Amino acid sequence: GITKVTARNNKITPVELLNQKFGNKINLGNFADAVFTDAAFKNVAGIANLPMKAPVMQVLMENSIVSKYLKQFVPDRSVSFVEEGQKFYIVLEDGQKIEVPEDVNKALKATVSDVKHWAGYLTEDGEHVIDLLKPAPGPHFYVNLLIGNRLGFKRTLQTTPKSVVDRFGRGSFRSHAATQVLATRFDMRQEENGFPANRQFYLYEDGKQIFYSALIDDNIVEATSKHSSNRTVIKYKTASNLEITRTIFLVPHKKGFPLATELQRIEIKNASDKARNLSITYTGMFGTGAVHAIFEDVTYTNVIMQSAALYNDKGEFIGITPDYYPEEFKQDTRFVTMIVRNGDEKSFPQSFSTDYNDFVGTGTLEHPAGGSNLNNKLNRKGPGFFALGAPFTVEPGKTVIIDTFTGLSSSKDNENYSDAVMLRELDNLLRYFEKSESVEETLNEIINFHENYGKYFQFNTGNKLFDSGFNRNLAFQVLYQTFMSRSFGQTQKGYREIGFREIQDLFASMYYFINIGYQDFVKELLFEWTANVYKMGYANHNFYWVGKQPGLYSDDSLWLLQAYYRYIIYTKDTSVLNEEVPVADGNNEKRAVRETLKAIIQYSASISVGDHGLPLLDLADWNDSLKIDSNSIDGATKEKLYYEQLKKTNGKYGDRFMSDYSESVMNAFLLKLAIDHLAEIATLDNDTQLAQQMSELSKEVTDRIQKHAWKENFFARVLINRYKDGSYTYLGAKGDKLSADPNIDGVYFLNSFAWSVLSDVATDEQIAIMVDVIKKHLLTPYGLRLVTPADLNKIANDTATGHYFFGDRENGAVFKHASMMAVAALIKAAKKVKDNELAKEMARIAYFMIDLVLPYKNLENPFQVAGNPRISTQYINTDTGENIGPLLSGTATWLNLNLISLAGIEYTRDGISFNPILREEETQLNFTLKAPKSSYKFSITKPVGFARMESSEYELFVDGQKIDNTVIPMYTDEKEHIVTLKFKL
Amino acid sequence: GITKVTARNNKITPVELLNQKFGNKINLGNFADAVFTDAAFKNVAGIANLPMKAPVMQVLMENSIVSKYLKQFVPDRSVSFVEEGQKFYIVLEDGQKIEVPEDVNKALKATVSDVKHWAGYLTEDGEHVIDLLKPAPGPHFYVNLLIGNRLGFKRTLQTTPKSVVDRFGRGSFRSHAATQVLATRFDMRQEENGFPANRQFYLYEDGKQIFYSALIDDNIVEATSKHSSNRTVIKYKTASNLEITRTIFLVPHKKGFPLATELQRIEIKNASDKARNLSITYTGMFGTGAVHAIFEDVTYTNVIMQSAALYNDKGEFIGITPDYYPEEFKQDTRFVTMIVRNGDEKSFPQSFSTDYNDFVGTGTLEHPAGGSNLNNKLNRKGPGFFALGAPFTVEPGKTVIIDTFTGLSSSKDNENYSDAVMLRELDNLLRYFEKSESVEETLNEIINFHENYGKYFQFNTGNKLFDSGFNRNLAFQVLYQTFMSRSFGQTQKGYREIGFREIQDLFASMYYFINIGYQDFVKELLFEWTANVYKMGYANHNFYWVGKQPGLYSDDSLWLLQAYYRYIIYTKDTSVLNEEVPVADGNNEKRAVRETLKAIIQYSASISVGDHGLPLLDLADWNDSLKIDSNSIDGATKEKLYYEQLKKTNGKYGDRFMSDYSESVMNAFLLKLAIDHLAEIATLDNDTQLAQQMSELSKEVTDRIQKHAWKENFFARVLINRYKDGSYTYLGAKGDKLSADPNIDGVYFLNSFAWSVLSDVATDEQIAIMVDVIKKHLLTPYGLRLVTPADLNKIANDTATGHYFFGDRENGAVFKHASMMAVAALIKAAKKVKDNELAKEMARIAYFMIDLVLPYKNLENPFQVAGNPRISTQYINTDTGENIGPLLSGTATWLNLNLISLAGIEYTRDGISFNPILREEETQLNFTLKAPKSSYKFSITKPVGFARMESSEYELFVDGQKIDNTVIPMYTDEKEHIVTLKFKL
Numbered sequence A, B: 001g002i003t004k005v006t007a008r009n010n011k012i013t014p015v016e017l018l019n020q021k022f023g024n025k026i027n028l029g030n031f032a033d034a035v036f037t038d039a040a041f042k043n044v045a046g047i048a049n050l051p052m053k054a055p056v057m058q059v060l061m062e063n064s065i066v067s068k069y070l071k072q073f074v075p076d077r078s079v080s081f082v083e084e085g086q087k088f089y090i091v092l093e094d095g096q097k098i099e100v101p102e103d104v105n106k107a108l109k110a111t112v113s114d115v116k117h118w119a120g121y122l123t124e125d126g127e128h129v130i131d132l133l134k135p136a137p138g139p140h141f142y143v144n145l146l147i148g149n150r151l152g153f154k155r156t157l158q159t160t161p162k163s164v165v166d167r168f169g170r171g172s173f174r175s176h177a178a179t180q181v182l183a184t185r186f187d188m189r190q191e192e193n194g195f196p197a198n199r200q201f202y203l204y205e206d207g208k209q210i211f212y213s214a215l216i217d218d219n220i221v222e223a224t225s226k227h228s229s230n231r232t233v234i235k236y237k238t239a240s241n242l243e244i245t246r247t248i249f250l251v252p253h254k255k256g257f258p259l260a261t262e263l264q265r266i267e268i269k270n271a272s273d274k275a276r277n278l279s280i281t282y283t284g285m286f287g288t289g290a291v292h293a294i295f296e297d298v299t300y301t302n303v304i305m306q307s308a309a310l311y312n313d314k315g316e317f318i319g320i321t322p323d324y325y326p327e328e329f330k331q332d333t334r335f336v337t338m339i340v341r342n343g344d345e346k347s348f349p350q351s352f353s354t355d356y357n358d359f360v361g362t363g364t365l366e367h368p369a370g371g372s373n374l375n376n377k378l379n380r381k382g383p384g385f386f387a388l389g390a391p392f393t394v395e396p397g398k399t400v401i402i403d404t405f406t407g408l409s410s411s412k413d414n415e416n417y418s419d420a421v422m423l424r425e426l427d428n429l430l431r432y433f434e435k436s437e438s439v440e441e442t443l444n445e446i447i448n449f450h451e452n453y454g455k456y457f458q459f460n461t462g463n464k465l466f467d468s469g470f471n472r473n474l475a476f477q478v479l480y481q482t483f484m485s486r487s488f489g490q491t492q493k494g495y496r497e498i499g500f501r502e503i504q505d506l507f508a509s510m511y512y513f514i515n516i517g518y519q520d521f522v523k524e525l526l527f528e529w530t531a532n533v534y535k536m537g538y539a540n541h542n543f544y545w546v547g548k549q550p551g552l553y554s555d556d557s558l559w560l561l562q563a564y565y566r567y568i569i570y571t572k573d574t575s576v577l578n579e580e581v582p583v584a585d586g587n588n589e590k591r592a593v594r595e596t597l598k599a600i601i602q603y604s605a606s607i608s609v610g611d612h613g614l615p616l617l618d619l620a621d622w623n624d625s626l627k628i629d630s631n632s633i634d635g636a637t638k639e640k641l642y643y644e645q646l647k648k649t650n651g652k653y654g655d656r657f658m659s660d661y662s663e664s665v666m667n668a669f670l671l672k673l674a675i676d677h678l679a680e681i682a683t684l685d686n687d688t689q690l691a692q693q694m695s696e697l698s699k700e701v702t703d704r705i706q707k708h709a710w711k712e713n714f715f716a717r718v719l720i721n722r723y724k725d726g727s728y729t730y731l732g733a734k735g736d737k738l739s740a741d742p743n744i745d746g747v748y749f750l751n752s753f754a755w756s757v758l759s760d761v762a763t764d765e766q767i768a769i770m771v772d773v774i775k776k777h778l779l780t781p782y783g784l785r786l787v788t789p790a791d792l793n794k795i796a797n798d799t800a801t802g803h804y805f806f807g808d809r810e811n812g813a814v815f816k817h818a819s820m821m822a823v824a825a826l827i828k829a830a831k832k833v834k835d836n837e838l839a840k841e842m843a844r845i846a847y848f849m850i851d852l853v854l855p856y857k858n859l860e861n862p863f864q865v866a867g868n869p870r871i872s873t874q875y876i877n878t879d880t881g882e883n884i885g886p887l888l889s890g891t892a893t894w895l896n897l898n899l900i901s902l903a904g905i906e907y908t909r910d911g912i913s914f915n916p917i918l919r920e921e922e923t924q925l926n927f928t929l930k931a932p933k934s935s936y937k938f939s940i941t942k943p944v945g946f947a948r949m950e951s952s953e954y955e956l957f958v959d960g961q962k963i964d965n966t967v968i969p970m971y972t973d974e975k976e977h978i979v980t981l982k983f984k985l
């Protein structure tokens, strides 16, 4: 009877049908576009010889002339557009070639003239210029992220405002935690992040709507947007010679200011020869305080709040605020205010509206019926919709400025908070910005701050796109992820706390902060993370104001050692070891940092270990899908049981916790790295005995890993101890009998090899074997996948079936974070392996994987790979090659680390270890580095081909003096030092 | 500095300013409209002498001519429009009167011509006719509810489809539980219930959009909607002489049909003299299976599903379905299909689109750029947006029909479910509706079913609006609430289970169902509710497939006795007492219904009692705000502790559970009523000894209530036992020291009096005293409020400080359910009190309260009271008088019961007790009643003034024979009996 055909089961594509029908008749070129003309997929209509893949037929069908002309042929007849000479022809399946009329030819040429830049382009500074009339390659492609600046104030990690702005100005604005200033929309589409009325405005002339900022109509002749670092600029040109500019950014915090403030400046210039009397209506929607009640009870959200008006000391209306009855929703107060600067005179809105139904009327949001006549009625219910209207006359050649301040004041930064505090802070903010030039000065301050922040490491390679992407975009993303973790984004709209392992972000940004005089901020972050470690050694999984989920995951506390090692090595500041930080257990208890690190190592190395001595897997580790044990316990219950066992067995503290739980090998690698880091810290702190115990413990752990985790072709991922019959003993190598692919003998994890190399456990032969294995199995045309297919139901029957189609997330996708860690391991191995061929192959693999994650390269084939040309995405779909969000992940952090490492810079106790690994085709690499008391200018020259310090003669000069030691000293003479490296044939 | 003025603090209204500026100059009439011209509220513009309150100035400002004319006076001057001699003038504050121009006069006369019908009107059948161009009085005013018909199938209460449709066809469509067929929107506004594209379509001619069903533009000359019982009809007329009709309803279930199916028929008639070639694009959005992930992870919702196409046996495309990868989301399969009927020719959609971005393009949803050229591309991701396009030619004077079937198949009605089951069921449904007249036959079947269902009680007064509201609208609402409880609505969008006390709905609908041959359905509902009672006597608070929250609330199980008593009294079917129903404890255990009722009575009367012997309050009772005890326990904990106490103290089953918890007096009234009901059931079942024990227990309970609950003016609400010092001992009468109002001595609860009268506990003197107290304190101009202000923090210092402004919900609002119970108590008292003046006063109060809840009376002042002219709302705002939803509540059930009781019909062991209570101004009341084997025609005549059988001589005739007994026998002779009552002065 009725049959069903799915999207993935439809094998034939329109382009394939077009190639079949017209391949031997016309030259299809390298790229072409096509569309099915009917629901039976029998006939196609397309255009040939495109410069790149693009939805050209979708744009063509929107043209009335072209669609009307095509109606003579389609459906029931396949046609193709072909350009010959300077004219366009239509070709049918019978070989007939017909010259199109003049209007059709003109429309076709105008459409296909600029296909190469349909998705935009990047300037020399890495800013993305977007045409507002073009289709979006993906939901994250045209997204910009804005952040505040709470440096030097309390609770910087928890109180920094955040915002997401798209190409049209749409998006949302959030204060501390998940508090909303502008409304966030939770709907079916990924493109709808906020309420559609946010940040939009209307322009009226003579009572007729002449402009809407979120709708490009026939009266707009030019409309472009520019995404830059922490600011967005949108430009419009109208047919009546009006030039409109919108600049959106976030105000850096000053004393007496509200906690969150977003500034939008609208400049309207009259390029005509006649004065024009216009009016502006700026609209928006406040975010509700009862987010759960949106899904629970919308009427509750509506009836608990009302609208209120704000007046200055002269009694003039200035803006609207939402007023809440319940006390819990009175701890934050929102506001929106408008100032109209006409030449030297200042004015304030003359009308307002607070009801969506009255404002829209019988029209739509794009053409509201009551937009030009605001009723000045204060709504007694929610939601907090607002529309402020003001008239103004602009003279020929003159400009009128409109400054809108949206924001929120909170009790999180004030004592005895009330609405009076909000009024005082709003008065301070308005007095600060009473002059026109103050907004420009603040914008310049933001730009200069980010430019100076990015100065720690500067690339100079001639490739402007790469230099801009690293020096500006990547540095900003690292700062943003340091301040925000993974809590906000275009599609990250729920409430999320800061994860412990997200300390990984501080692995990259700290060197930047220390280089702008904010070493104390890095110390504060380190102590804040240390405060979430319990006395035994486990840590809270998440924390925003307080910690939660104690010891839920077994790998969390082991990441802190890497951050402490990085900070102490870079700064040589061991005094942080003596700092007394509160313990996560509580009850006014404090411990020295050194003792906390010792407790972490002891917990992961002696107490929470399995039969083979490797750390217990517990519920899971870094890999969230490794739910091998269904009877796992957290830190608190494990501690209680451990104390019970100690009292029963009459043992001593530090003994093994008896159990039959599984062991994590990646946890063992992390523990070994942490032990080595603590040994280095102790020997830097003149703690000889502690260094000795750390060294012997590291040797013992390495012996255990080599004895019990190496399975003759790979390092295992999990060791299983609960099957006494021997049915299953390990997972993550050959012979584990858990592979779900008949053609693959065993399961293989990328992280196993990555952290075997990173922890300096694997040997050269093991490195070569694992590299061969990952080349055979884990390498895909779109990168390196996290893991080969596995059948975990045999050992854990409680695991459910899959949730994703092939190529998505857990079903064979390429996760860029894990791939970046693997690339770091490959670089580290290639820097020191004896075999030159193995090093060359590993460097080639690393560069191949790096080329797939650089955001700017997303603009080469934007409509196939999607992603974002300035911000890193999460993973790559192995079925289509498309980059899919969210935009916040460890990809940016580990990519920055990998690029710096490939430049050859490493930090050790003796100073700067230099060991660059350049591309085979590269012949020159120049960059500049900053140190707290010096600067370095590195230049490297080499011939075409692979070259490295390990197996190639070279000349190294520091300050013009030839040197043999590759460790550059960390100078403190406040002088610039020139370093030159030359590779010979 | 900056000051803030809230909506409630702005005392001066525009109408007050208009009255103070023009009151002594022109005649403003009884009603007027006004609007502030500026944000300083200094000047006003308005229109005088309106027939009723309406937003006339909002509509006037939308007129370009009127707005342009007004722009020459406002905002600097205050103006008023006045009609004098069919000519409009404008009046200024200086006394100047100016005749408006001709166009302004024409627009003004056209606008205010039909102000009285701006919110619509009701037909003789109670159907609401709505103009699509007029403002909505409230978010629930233009809402219609549609329900399916699963009678005679399995799990009717859990599998009946439901739908909400507004005046434009917007809304949503749901299946079993909260399963969505069409997408539900969770946003800030109450008006947005579903996705905007649901049930909407576009009409194109020559590639240009000529019609959109959700937007009224200048090309539409007529646009009206009609809300009827279980169907919605919308009509449009275009300037090009096109007549469009949409009919939306739900298909009653048949064997082999899908579980949920919504049918929309679109008829397009060409009233011109030329044949027209048009095309239709019907759009919509499927509901997602991962509702929580919408707020959690929108990308997850997008990537777990794809689009698929459906083809018939001939290989022709017929529709779109969403295909899910995860197993848990594969248990339901959605579908949308289209059929085009051109005379006898049948055709299917020729194109489709499944991407929102491609469909909308550079336009909007109202004017999509790719609407006329669907790309026929199956989306690989979500959401399930669909748009089906088909062309057709309509001849002059001819009609083209388009039938769209949306729906869902589920595993809840099938075994070994897969998509093949959905395909087979869809094939069955399409085969059933292959003829054009099948849709009309199904619609007529629905109409006839509801007409026949409403025939149990038929009023035959002269109002013709009250008759329609009761006979059709109220009966349908009672049926809808019986099937749906309080789970769905315009603003009720979350997932809700069936509450136990919602058995109250069956109090009213059962007599209807029994009278259409569905007594077995009522028995099934009774047994389903009985299955949720535990062995001890408590019950689950909620249940959809299984019960949950055992014994959480102390009043739940006591409501079942009333339902059983009603059923047994009406049907005389005591065999239900012998039925073996599973107990809620489980483990294959069954108990007779009689034993379950006995256990309920024993639990509420002997075990779960306090110091005074009244039932324990536990967490709460019917009143959810009575959280007096913060250490309350549920049924399971209480049972475990009771067994521990019994074993410790060597007691026996049936002894009191020792504690110091509070006691609920309303629970005591419910228990007394249940005991009386069980006594009546026992004596009807020839169970003499059980009747004797029930009688003595009822006497003991009455003695306890009279001794311990009556405090010198009122019946207390809660008895407090945890203060040995005597600081607080009771709440809900005079002297409880818990009043929050200094002018009120004590707190007073309406339900206390209501259920004292309803349980036949209060005496005549107590009734008079409580009536006086209610008139003094609990009576407001907008009805009877639930409770006087109270300060519960003195005994329960853990509750919040309040969530609502004055007049909303818990803060002094009039809850219509509690008011209806109080009205029932007033009617019952007035039917039997000795004092004629007291009975007259109580009847007057009851009728005054009833006049405030009748939905049709909402059309008298629609723009002030709002509500819904056909469906009851929840409560009335005591600050403004506005009716606020949701539309589902016990108001409808108790209003139906109250109206039937006021008609004088009661059911007792001897038959029909007759005791009408008519309005003072009424002089004639005729109605018809149905009994399972007979029919009655009641006529009552009386002079002007209060009259009742208690204190007035009368003549009663049955079948022409004068009788003295007022109990009409329940005849079973299948004949109509005439009953006549005459009241004489």
Ligand SMILES: [Cl-]
Pocket: A488, A489, A490, A491, A492, A885, A886, A887, A888
């Ligand atoms: Cl994101």
Ligand SMILES: [Cl-]
Pocket: A622, A623, A749, A751, A752
């Ligand atoms: Cl892993």
Ligand SMILES: [Cl-]
Pocket: B488, B489, B490, B491, B492, B885, B886, B887, B888
């Ligand atoms: Cl509702």
Ligand SMILES: [Cl-]
Pocket: B622, B623, B749, B751, B752
């Ligand atoms: Cl109550």
